[PDB]
Amino acid sequence: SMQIFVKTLTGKTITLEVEPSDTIENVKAKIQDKEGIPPDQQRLIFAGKQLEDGRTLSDYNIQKESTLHLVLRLRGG
């Protein structure tokens, strides 16, 4: 279990205790516990790449003190 940082919609940082085996869905559920954003509205960016549902944090090499960036979807067309 490791601690990671999430920079949220106001720029304000929160923490999460996660496993390298947790999935992006579980990370998004914890973010919902802390922020109130449904996991289907969440986009998580780590090191420039968006984290895909169905993968794990170890797939992305996210370790202690890695920072996710939380954005939403602004739909247009």
């Binding site: 601690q3 940082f5 920079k7 919609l9 106001t10 720029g11 304000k12 940082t13 929160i14 923490t15 802390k34 922020e35 109130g36 954003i37 509205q41 986009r43 960016i45 780590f46 090191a47 420039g48 790449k49 968006q50 003190e65 890695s66 920072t67 960036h69 954005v71 939403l72 979807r73 602004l74 739909r75 247009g76 067309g77």
Partner: protein, 330 residues
Amino acid sequence: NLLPFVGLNNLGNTSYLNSILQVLYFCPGFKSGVKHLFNIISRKKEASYELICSLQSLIISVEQLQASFLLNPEKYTDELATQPRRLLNTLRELNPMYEGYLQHDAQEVLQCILGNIQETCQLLKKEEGFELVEKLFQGQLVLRTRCLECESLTERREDFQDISVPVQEDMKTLRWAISQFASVERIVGEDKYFCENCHHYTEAERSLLFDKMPEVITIHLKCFAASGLSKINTPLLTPLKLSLEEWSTKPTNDSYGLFAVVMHSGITISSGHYTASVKVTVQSLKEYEGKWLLFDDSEVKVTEEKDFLNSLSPSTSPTSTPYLLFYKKL
């Protein structure tokens, strides 16, 4: 009264892709990088490559329509536009969310295109201008944490392709937004840091510093809020020149100049319209240098520097909300 600038026809809710494709067509070095990669792939095929092939086809289509309009501007009455059908096909192959005719995120489709170009480059290199995306859009962040108990420092290096700044605290400038992103923040309370030197939960200071810098800075504006998700339509006061030295690991004299804006129109976040503004950088194509083209799908308007800068202001409350800002290194 048509300008010699090729718009893109909306193929059904596809302005998210159109405005990104315009910003990329006018990004300095992206056309040349795609042409180089396509030369490589075509020699390899005469001896995953479909994003490059279909971007190259779109780029040549835009170039040839511009040339034919400049040759016979009479065969062109209503609009000078083309369709990105093949490239939308390629995006639906690369990512099934673009199947159909729904509305999407411009920053997300930009991230998809650039990520796939980078994967193609890494494939070509591993098999063997193979660092197009890394040189144009990628930088280094140094993410420093200071325990407020023991006052020890831990660092991380992370890549970035854009800076996601807030537009609202919960008139403000882009500098305020970048400070909210990178100035020292103090994480406390429920968000205490776990220090391994203390083996305890502590309060901590986090700060970010730009280490290596791209040639193009993309600012992703978080123009959305949670209470229940809403859109923030009040913009920041956006500058024409930008320096990031206040948040850099070293002194720099490298400043940046705004060259492209993607705007969102709509009172919600679940729908709307994307438009792109682009700064222009054969003699007929120099009465436009320094002027701003507004790309509304197949319609192309021109605008002066000062009028464009005014239309961005929060005081003249705009209906197009800035969403992506593009700054290139001067």
